[PDB]
Amino acid sequence: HPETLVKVKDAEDQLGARVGYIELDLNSGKILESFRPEERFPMMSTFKVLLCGAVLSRVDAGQEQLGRRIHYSQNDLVEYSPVTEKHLTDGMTVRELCSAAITMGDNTAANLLLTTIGGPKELTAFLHNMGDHVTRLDRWEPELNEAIPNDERDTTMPAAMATTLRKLLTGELLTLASRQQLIDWMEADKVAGPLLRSALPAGWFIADKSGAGERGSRGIIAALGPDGKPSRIVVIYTTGSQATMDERNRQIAEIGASLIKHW
Incomplete structure (x- = not known):
């Protein structure tokens, strides 16, 4: 709904930055609404879903096993590793x-x-x-x-x-x-x-x-939807803002509130 694009543009104004947005119908794959659909944005940790999709593909092909144990050391640890830091000596599947x-x-x-x-x-x-x-x-x-x-x-x-x-x-x-x-x-x-x-x-x-x-x-x-079942996909990215983390979060939540309102 264009009222959600109003909120996307409002976010660009408040954050002083580009915001990319897509609302897609899960069933058909039709794009319901978009803003900067074909501009590039850093994926950041959202890539982790794609990574695990590739891992699962390998499991499906018999090239990997979900229960296989991986061992690692202090050398592999990078910043923000809440779970892995606790299993250095146990390894993790x-x-x-x-x-x-x-x-x-x-x-x-x-x-x-x-x-x-x-x-x-x-x-x-x-x-x-x-x-x-x-x-x-x-x-x-x-x-x-x-x-x-x-x-x-x-x-x-x-x-x-x-x-x-x-x-x-x-x-x-x-x-x-x-x-x-x-x-x-x-x-x-x-x-x-x-x-x-x-x-x-x-x-x-x-x-x-x-x-x-x-x-x-x-x-x-x-992927979200009413009644405990997903029915649409939403993607929101932004980069370039000098705003606080709380401000960026508030703007993304507001775009979310609008897409729920005009669902």
Whole structure:
């Protein structure tokens, strides 16, 4: 609804920055509303959903096992690794790593998973192969959040990320078991509380993943809907703002409130 574009433009005014937005119908794949659909934005941690989709694809192909234990050391630890820092001597299974990366935003878990699938190069190839010709991962954790202006490394386009998420959650790319596991990890997302979840009516469903990076970068990808079932995908990205984290969060929540109001 254009009233939601009013809120997207209002966010650009309040944040002094570009905001990208897509509302997509989950069933059909039709774009219901958009703003800067084909401009690039840093993905930040939202790439972790794509990463775990690539891991699940490998599990489906018999190239990986969710129960395989991965061992690592102090050397692999990077900033903000809440779960992995507690298992240095126990190691963690692939499944536990994806859960940590998506639900707890664990950065080391993401880097360990990246290594298992062949790194940024292979994730980019996986994406191109499933039809996303613009999303690209080039670096590893902490560096992929650098968000240098005009840099295309580690970026996506709102329209591309939205359709890619629809393909992963409801397309034929992953098996039914894997699709459900991916959305279950997203539904247990515990670090995106101040974003779309804060504007979600009671009883609604949401599976999401948020990201934050340098230079005011902030974003979220989500599948949501009434009655405990997802029916639309929403992607919101912003970069370039000098505003506080609370301000950026408030603006994203307001765009969410508007899309719920005009649902």
